[PDB]
Symmetry: D2
Subunit: 115 residues, 4 copies
């Protein structure tokens, strides 16, 4: 599992459950091609997005659908999504965890890169 | 200015100077139409992006492009490119400050909304 | 002011107003000796804590006490109390801005050091 | 394991390895009593600090010795430590993870509280 997303909720002090995540890959013509998607589990984690074979070198965009998440919990948030763009596997294959910490008017996204 | 953007370097503890900022507004036909752009000043702030007249209700995107900033200072590499997407002015005109805190493998962003 | 403290509410996207701030300086005999204190203004900032004359080299601690702020507005509960410890002026006098971003189960702090 | 600490390094995009952590508990006389300590492992995690029996209701302080960490890696950081104070188990026993994200001039500490 070379690409994983983990989401925490700073209001509840909990994993962020059932948050939708959409991943895109930049195509040769500089448009965004859909690459993978899913929703976080009870642990706030989303596994199984891709395989080592398909997760080739490139520029990737991870979008975390935070607005829908907060609204469902009764909170009006600021952002539509949390988003981060990064280049992956340009020094060879690595495992990436995108760790997101969410508040209604703020977030952080961190890439934890191993192997 | 109803929209201000501030960029900070979390490695050096400094304003990030001469960082390119691009703002977009979402059209019907879900395409991001260019809205404003500029570069951060000595204080890491970018003022005068727009006016109250033109900054109407909508979904906006702020992209922080750091390449020229880190090349010039000679510093490493912020692999995480920030894109901050939000609805503005849906409850009336407000003053928005969008702050971005940059690290090589992370960024944080906060919105302060006044008035 | 060579030391400024700024407090933001990450749930509301607002300055945290009337937050009590206590600053200490570390003595020989590892005891924190009181140095300065005040409450944040409308802008969430606290200016005039000290002067360049008195703000000499040392280890300082900034404690952000939020109890009165959240009781008055009636808001939930920031269970994480912030304590920010740092050496100041060891490379000559600088201007320090200590920012704290508060959530119920998290906080973030950043230092911007100029001159 | 009711109290765990996990530390990430935003410069390296990695777990923060061999970071010292000191935990204190507020005594009846309002002084800080040493409670537990240890160092993070290769995963950036520190387990085994305490037991459910000994981790009673109270006010706890977690200190993460970040200065020593950064200096060892060749980076001059701003803070002496990252520190967070919180009340634990006042609604009954819970499991706490203190998730810390570190940059040289900024950090965040989040309490993830389960059970």
């Amino acid at each position: 599992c070379p690409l994983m997303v983990k989401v925490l909720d700073a209001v509840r002090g909990s994993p962020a459950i059932n948050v939708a995540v959409h991943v895109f890959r930049k195509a040769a013509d500089d448009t965004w091609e859909p690459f993978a998607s899913g929703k976080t589990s009870e642990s706030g984690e989303l596994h199984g997005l891709t395989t080592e074979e398909e997760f080739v070198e490139g520029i990737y965009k991870v979008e975390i659908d935070t607005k829908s998440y907060w609204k469902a919990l009764g909170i009006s948030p600021f952002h539509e999504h949390a988003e981060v763009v990064f280049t992956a596997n340009d020094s060879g294959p690595r495992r990436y965890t995108i760790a997101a910490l969410l508040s209604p008017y703020s977030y952080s996204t961190t890439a934890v890169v191993t192997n």
